[PDB]
Design a protein around this nucleic acid. Sequence first.
DNA 1: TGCGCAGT
DNA 2: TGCGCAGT
Lengths: 431, 431
Amino acid sequence: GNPFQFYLTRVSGVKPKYNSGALHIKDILSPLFGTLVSSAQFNYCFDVDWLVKQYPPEFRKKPILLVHGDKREAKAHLHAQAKPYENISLCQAKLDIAFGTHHTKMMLLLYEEGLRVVIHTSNLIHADWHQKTQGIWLSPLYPRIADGTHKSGESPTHFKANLISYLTAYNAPSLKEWIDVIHKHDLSETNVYLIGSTPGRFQGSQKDNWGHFRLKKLLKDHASSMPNAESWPVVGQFSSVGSLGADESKWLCSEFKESMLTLGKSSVPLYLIYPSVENVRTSLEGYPAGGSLPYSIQTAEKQNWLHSYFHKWSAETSGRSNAMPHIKTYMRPSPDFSKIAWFLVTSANLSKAAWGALEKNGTQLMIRSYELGVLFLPSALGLDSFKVKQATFPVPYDLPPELYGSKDRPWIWNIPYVKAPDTHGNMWVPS
Amino acid sequence: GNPFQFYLTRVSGVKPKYNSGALHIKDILSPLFGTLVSSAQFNYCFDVDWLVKQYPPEFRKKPILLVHGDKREAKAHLHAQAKPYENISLCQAKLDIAFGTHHTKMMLLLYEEGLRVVIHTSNLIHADWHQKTQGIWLSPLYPRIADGTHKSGESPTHFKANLISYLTAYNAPSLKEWIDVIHKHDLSETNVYLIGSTPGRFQGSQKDNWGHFRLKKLLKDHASSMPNAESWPVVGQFSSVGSLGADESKWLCSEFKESMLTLGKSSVPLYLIYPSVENVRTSLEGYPAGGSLPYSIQTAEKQNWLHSYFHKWSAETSGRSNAMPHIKTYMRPSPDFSKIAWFLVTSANLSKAAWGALEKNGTQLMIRSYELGVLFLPSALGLDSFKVKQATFPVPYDLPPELYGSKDRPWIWNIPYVKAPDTHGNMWVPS
DNA sequence: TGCGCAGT
DNA sequence: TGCGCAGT
């Protein structure tokens, strides 16, 4: 019981001092953490054979529910993958808005001794846990509420109700079982706030339930303004970039940064962290790290204005400068970067699909995707701010963020790079 | 028989030396120009009572066809206006693409002694012929082809066929009669090229039939490149402005200026002439000239980039600096403005609706509106260029065009101007 | 799939 | 009305 329960995944090919205190998926599903009865795996991509092999032998026949958003042929492929294992069910989360994804990454782990909730950033495929920087939040072991005891099991941060609303929004019968399981467990120790996105169009007070308006509300109610508030940068850090509009006022600096700079009841610097071509080239994977950084040329050339916000991936602090980011984080550092007002780890990349965007003249928040993250607020630990670990929050990358040099360019996955070979002597030719 | 047959309308309140050689509608429908049998009036707005009173008493019972594009209630109002006059029919030109207008202004004037075609810029309402600068082209009197003579009646410029294709595109039975009438007349003297727009989506070689691609083709085939071609500005001059896109490369400088700078088989300066607020304020009409310059704030604030092309209305040359422009013109002056490579007078304002814009990756030219204009090419008079009248072409405004001062702003019809009174002591409050 | 857009 | 748009 350190306060944050924030971990990185294990990286192959770094010194083992950068992997001590890091978690592989195998560690997470270990018998150490409890005697497993069943599980639910919420994700975007699955390699089903690999996933089963991550569970310990004693636990491989226990019911697994996969919660995915694939349709049609993808769906049929995933069903086919799952066919060999009788213990495995599937739940297709409904995606009624186009270009939506079931992007949330979460494990519900039901044990004989209680319940664990893991919220993280990694797809259920080998490459996502191999040589990338990913983030993980581990809930405590939530004990079961005794049969005749009447308690809510709720925390000051309202995690239990907030999780249940997130699950309730799917409308899925196989998730009813998980909702009932959460109901019977005591989640009162939880010291983080849940930030979910769910697909839809939301009006009035429901705008606050999801996406970046949910973050805004949490910050309004549970953080407080700082003297010189103006000067506390916002830092966003992500692996995919959506179509953000013709200029910054369309969404980024207008409705996204607004929500993010809220504190209690604008020239706030915005630093955006996204790997350069050069970062990808010299990575542990080389150019094929690029396959998980899907910023397409067509999107990029609409929005060249964006790339002057862009800063290098740099992670000397966690030995992970060459372990390309699939983690997404957002945070509110002080101007000197020695402390932070809050920290969010989430599945949500820098997209309107993920965070939400306003339609019909401000009356309506549209969200295409399922997302999930956890907000770390000083107030939930009786503090005003966290010191950055150089009590103190473990920021996985270096501060302050360093601006792309003038020869740098963002990684764009679907053009060739044939001038300089990568780490493994290779070029990149999408095809 | 001066070569151009290009006239301005009569302006009330200027010295009569600026109205000698100018034409009122009454002059155009005069018995002087022939003994009228019937007529067709192509236009956008009609005041039917006023129009009938423009025809001489002897000619008021002769068949008039009105060719309009009104639907629904507008249509019913125009039908009601026309009700009292048994000699008057109507033809509704089909407008299958939204935000299209039947904007063409043309009179077909059938006489006992032959046929006249008038192509011009004025709506058939009193205010359009009162104190505005408008343009008129008068065809010669085309004699009838004798019954057993076999001649085409065509000109070197292909006017007759080109007019007939324009009329044929309406698909209107009441226009069949006019097509047959044009067929029986000799139009061989015509020394101008017809430039039409008609509504639709046009592919392949049909892209060249209409709008700005029609202008491009004419310029390719019948003008020739100039030494220093690069440096001959393009001048556009209009009374309405459409939505041209988020920046200049979207249409204006990409496909519109391209068509306009074509000469035979880019840093070409583009000068756009459009009345400032100050031009409208001190006009003969004052702020109500604004009612015919319908550039709305919503369109303007999307495209502030445009307004650095904007130049004042100035017309000392024709005594018409205070007679606000409803004429539209485009032309190709030399760098010193002493001569021009060509001149176009037309109904088409600075809009994609009018000129056309490419859809589906360059394969398709979409046009919303009916338009019509006449192109004056030196080659059709055996010349290489026209000297500007200061043989020589009568440019109705001053050269070179003068840039908006830094306190000037474009006229925008639907915001208030309440700081400085106009010519008649009034303010402007749309409402 | 449904939003936002487009005249004189 | 029909075009262009929008994910990881």
